[PDB]
């Protein structure tokens, strides 16, 4: 009756014309109004195969977010190695807003409603929707910020667990807030996390993960190398680019007081959006503060395991399309 297929999707949001925050404006131009009354049909007697690691929707969302960052986070200067271009450096105000993805005529989205679907394989509980849930396009590393949560209990997602080159995304079942501040009166900054909630969630994630490695001892370590965007929790807050040391986050011995991360805001960055360093203007004055919900983590498992104990996991930036995978995982476009 239908077949797997790719196609051109359109976006939908609650962006308002009066609102001048950059994403919101981009949405009033690129997107349409969110469905006032969504319709989700679930039918018994059907089975479908899903593969989130090979979902074209990820590529499309990727192109949009690249488009969004090209007209909103236009930098003061670009060093693309082949050239160095100067250009306006507009002050940036943005908060991501949820964006819904929808299908054109003659296509449709399938939604997997298995409460413990790990991301690959056949699905039993299948439904049909014309649009995804509202997804916030948070570009971040190490930590997945402001995403959806597991309905039942923590879930480990990966294309091949064994394959150490396959990205691991942990999908928490209960989010933990991260408070980031830069006082006024310059590049210094800090983050705050409740040690108790966090560490509890670590106990739980390590037990589930271990559950997937034949009960062998699981240990965490800081990144082994690489660019600053990867080795630190990196994200864009109120137009500023934060880079926080997470060394402190993965502290083996306490497994509680509220732990606080040292962060810095940078003007020179490696664009994720492609290649080259971008130079933004100096950090504006005034106290700057982002409070986000940690809902996921990206990890890379160390190679050359050898003796059974001590799998070593490093929070891993991997590829940003993985941020989109972490939200798009349960959907697929099929062609009627």
């Amino acid at each position: 009756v239908w077949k797997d297929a790719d196609t051109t999707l359109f976006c939908a949001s609650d962006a308002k014309a009066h609102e001048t925050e950059c994403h919101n404006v981009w949405a009033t131009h690129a997107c349409v109004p969110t469905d006032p009354n969504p319709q989700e049909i679930h039918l018994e007697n059907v089975t479908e195969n899903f593969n989130m690691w090979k979902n074209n929707m990820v590529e499309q969302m990727q192109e949009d977010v690249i488009s969004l960052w090209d007209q909103c986070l236009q930098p003061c200067v670009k060093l693309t190695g082949g050239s160095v271009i100067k250009q306006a450096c507009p002050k940036i105000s943005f908060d991501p807003i949820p964006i819904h993805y929808c299908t054109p005529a003659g296509y449709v989205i399938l939604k997997c409603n298995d409460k413990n679907f790990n991301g690959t394989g056949p699905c039993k509980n299948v439904s049909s929707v014309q649009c995804t849930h509202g997804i916030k396009p948070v570009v971040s590393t190490q930590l997945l910020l402001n995403g959806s949560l597991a309905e039942e209990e923590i879930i480990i997602r990966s294309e091949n667990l064994t394959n150490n080159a396959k990205t691991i995304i942990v999908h928490l079942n209960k989010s933990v807030e991260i408070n980031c501040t830069r006082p006024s009166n310059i590049r210094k900054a800090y983050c705050e996390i409740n040690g108790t909630k966090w560490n509890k969630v670590l106990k739980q994630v390590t037990e589930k993960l271990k559950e997937h490695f034949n009960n062998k001892t699981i240990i965490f370590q800081p990144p082994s190398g690489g660019d600053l965007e990867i080795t630190m929790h990196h994200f864009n807050c109120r137009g500023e680019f934060f880079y926080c040391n997470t060394t402190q986050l993965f502290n083996n011995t306490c497994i509680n007081g509220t732990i606080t991360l040292p962060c810095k805001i940078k003007q020179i960055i490696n664009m994720w959006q492609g290649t080259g360093q971008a130079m933004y203007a100096p950090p504006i004055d005034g106290k700057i503060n982002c409070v986000s919900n940690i809902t996921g983590i990206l990890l890379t498992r160390d190679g050359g395991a050898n003796n059974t104990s001590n799998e070593t996991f490093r929070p891993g930036g991997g590829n940003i399309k993985d941020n989109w995978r972490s939200e798009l995982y349960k959907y697929k476009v099929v062609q009627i």
Partner: antibody, heavy 120, light 100 residues
Framework: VQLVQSGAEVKKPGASVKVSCKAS????????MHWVRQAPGQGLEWMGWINPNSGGTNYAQKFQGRVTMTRDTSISTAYMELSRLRSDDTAVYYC??????????????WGQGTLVTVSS | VLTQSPATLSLSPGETAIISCRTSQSGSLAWYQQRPGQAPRLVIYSGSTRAAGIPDRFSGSRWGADYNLSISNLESGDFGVYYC?????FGQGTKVQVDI
């Protein structure tokens, strides 16, 4: 596709070594770069990989703490530095890339190799 | 780990060589050939699939943990040492040499 490594090296124990690997004929940033060595009387031994766009790395665990992988995208080159050399680090060091298509392990392309002799 | 056997193989041209490899983990197993003084060249992947420029003389077959690489009708280019591979792990190698 071509992969060209720097030439042979002789070092004293405790010294460090830096091997280069120049890639051409493909999008350099597009594919993980692995390193694999082969010491005499030893089988082939994988050391680690780097993700070129990121500069991110994974290392074979026995190699933690003494191996450094980096790259210079401006010249499509990967670098492997091995510090605090021991005599049983005497080996041919190779850089390798995944098969064109990807699985990323099937090692379709190899550098010509760089010989490193470590001896007092 | 990866156990490759036999350790050594002394054969005449024309004959067929049978190398075996034991894994304990399932997944893609590959075979490499390394000629004296050259970089290894990929010979087989997925346990059974030949690569580019690899002639019919080379063939792989598989049974459970056991993996076989079979090289039929040996010729001068074929001699060297062979490795089985699974993800980041390699076998110890099998040196196949000529004794006319």
């Amino acid at each position: 596709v071509q992969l060209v490594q720097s030439g042979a090296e002789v070092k004293k124990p405790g010294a460090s070594v830096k091997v280069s690997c120049k890639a051409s004929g493909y999008t350099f940033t597009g594919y993980y770069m692995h390193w694999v060595r082969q010491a005499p009387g030893q089988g082939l031994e994988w050391m680690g990989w780097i993700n070129p766009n990121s500069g991110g790395t994974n290392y074979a665990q026995k190699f933690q703490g003494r191996v450094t992988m980096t790259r210079d995208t401006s010249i499509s080159t990967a670098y492997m530095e091995l510090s605090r050399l021991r005599s049983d680090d005497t080996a041919v060091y190779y850089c390798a890339r995944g098969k064109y298509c990807y699985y990323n392990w099937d090692f379709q392309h190899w550098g010509q190799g760089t010989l490193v002799t470590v001896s007092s | 780990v990866l156990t490759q056997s036999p350790a050594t193989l002394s054969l005449s041209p024309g004959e067929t060589a049978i190398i075996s490899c034991r894994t304990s983990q399932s997944g893609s197993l590959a075979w490499y050939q390394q000629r004296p003084g050259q970089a290894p060249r990929l010979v087989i992947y997925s346990g059974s699939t030949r690569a580019a420029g690899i002639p019919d003389r080379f063939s792989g077959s598989r049974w459970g943990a056991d993996y076989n690489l079979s090289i039929s009708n040996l010729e001068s280019g074929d001699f060297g040492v062979y490795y089985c591979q699974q993800y980041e792990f390699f076998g110890q190698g099998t040196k196949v040499q000529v004794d006319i």
